[PDB]
Amino acid sequence: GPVKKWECTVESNPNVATFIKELTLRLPDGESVDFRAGGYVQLECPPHVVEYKDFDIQPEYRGDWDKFNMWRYVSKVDETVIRAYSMANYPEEQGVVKFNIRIASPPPGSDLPPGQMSSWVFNLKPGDKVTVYGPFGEFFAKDTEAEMVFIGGGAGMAPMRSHIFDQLRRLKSNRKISFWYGARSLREAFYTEEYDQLQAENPNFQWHLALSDPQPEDNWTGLTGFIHNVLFENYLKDHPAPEDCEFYMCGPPMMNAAVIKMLTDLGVERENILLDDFG
Ligand SMILES: Cc1cc2nc3c(=O)[nH]c(=O)nc-3n(C[C@H](O)[C@H](O)[C@H](O)COP(=O)(O)OP(=O)(O)OC[C@H]3O[C@@H](n4cnc5c(N)ncnc54)[C@H](O)[C@@H]3O)c2cc1C
Ligand SMILES: N#Cc1ccc(Cn2cnc3ccccc32)cc1
Ligand SMILES: [Mg+2]
Numbered sequence: 001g002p003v004k005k006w007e008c009t010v011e012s013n014p015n016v017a018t019f020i021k022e023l024t025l026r027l028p029d030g031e032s033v034d035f036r037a038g039g040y041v042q043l044e045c046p047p048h049v050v051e052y053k054d055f056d057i058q059p060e061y062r063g064d065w066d067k068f069n070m071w072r073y074v075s076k077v078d079e080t081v082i083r084a085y086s087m088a089n090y091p092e093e094q095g096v097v098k099f100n101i102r103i104a105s106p107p108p109g110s111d112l113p114p115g116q117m118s119s120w121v122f123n124l125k126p127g128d129k130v131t132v133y134g135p136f137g138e139f140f141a142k143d144t145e146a147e148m149v150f151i152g153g154g155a156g157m158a159p160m161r162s163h164i165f166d167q168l169r170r171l172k173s174n175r176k177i178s179f180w181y182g183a184r185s186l187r188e189a190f191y192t193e194e195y196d197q198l199q200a201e202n203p204n205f206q207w208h209l210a211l212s213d214p215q216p217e218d219n220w221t222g223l224t225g226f227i228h229n230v231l232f233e234n235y236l237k238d239h240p241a242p243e244d245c246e247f248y249m250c251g252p253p254m255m256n257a258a259v260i261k262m263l264t265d266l267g268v269e270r271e272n273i274l275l276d277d278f279g
Pocket of ligand 1: 081
């Protein structure tokens with residue numbers, strides 16, 4: 001049916017990585033969003049001014065905000081803006097919509113305006129009101145028996161979480177499913193307890209965190225490098241039939257491109273690769 005509108009309330013908005021927040025919105029009582037995993041809603045902001053020094057950023061992430069001179073940015077938005085954000089919750093988690101949102105600050109050293117909506121999102125405090133429209137979606141799972149390979153980075157975590165819980169918790173799928181998540185260092189990884197629990201509950205599920213720049217404090221001995229190299233060397237190189245898998249990708253643009261080239265070089269058909277392009 002037609003687009004629905006909900007006036008929601010912010011429940012929480014912590015950082016989950018240096019430049020990503022988990023925004024949770026409480027729908028007005030007695031309402032829920034009838035969405036499909038991989039789908040999204042539109043958030044709206046009114047005209048405003050936000051100053052980055054007003055943000056609540058958890059302590060461990062502040063040093064990089066200082067390093068990147070983030071606190072001096074100011075965003076002036078003179079008209080209502082609408083932007084799409086993917087649901088991080090899966091359809092059964094009701095009463096809320098949860099998001100993973102990256103702050104799109106100006107290219108460093110440029111004089112460009114800060115990202116309009118994401119700068120506003122980063123100043124949202126518990127109790128603030130946010131208008132939401134939807135549901136929408138097209139990044140949906142195929143209904144087959146094929147092995148699934150989920151590949152995420154950055155705020156592309158959100159549809160990955162929605163997809164993976166939807167398969168394992170609602171569809172109770174016995175399909176072979178793996179999730180490969182690329183991040184710079186341990187500080188940028190999140191939902192690790194959730195995926196570890198899903199792996200311990202479902203023998204058909206396996207997840208892999210790969211760090212491209214592990215920090216000294218990480219003492220990292222896990223998978224290391226960029227996710228396309230890691231996924232190839234640790235799983236797809238020896239796979240008997242990678243072209244029989246369904247690949248679901250959502251990351252930053254450079255990651256999307258590198259993973260796609262890797263896959264097609266392997267002989268995977270672009271029709272077996274589904275990309276959520278945040279744009
Ligand atoms: C279906 C869909 C789902 C999405 N899901 C998510 C999600 O789950 N999480 C998420 O974080 N994002 C998601 N996105 C992206 C999101 O909708 C926004 O595009 C993103 O948040 C940036 O919007 P913004 O208004 O903050 O920045 P914008 O105002 O659109 O600015 C974007 C960037 O451009 C820079 N810029 C400004 N002016 C210029 C200029 N003249 N030249 C060059 N650069 C300039 C800004 O400083 C900023 O870095 C999704 C998008 C789609 C379409
Ligand atoms: N948002 C975000 C985000 C940005 C970079 C990385 C590091 N990373 C890992 N694999 C990569 C492939 C190509 C390019 C970068 C890559 C991870 C997440
Ligand atoms: Mg306020």
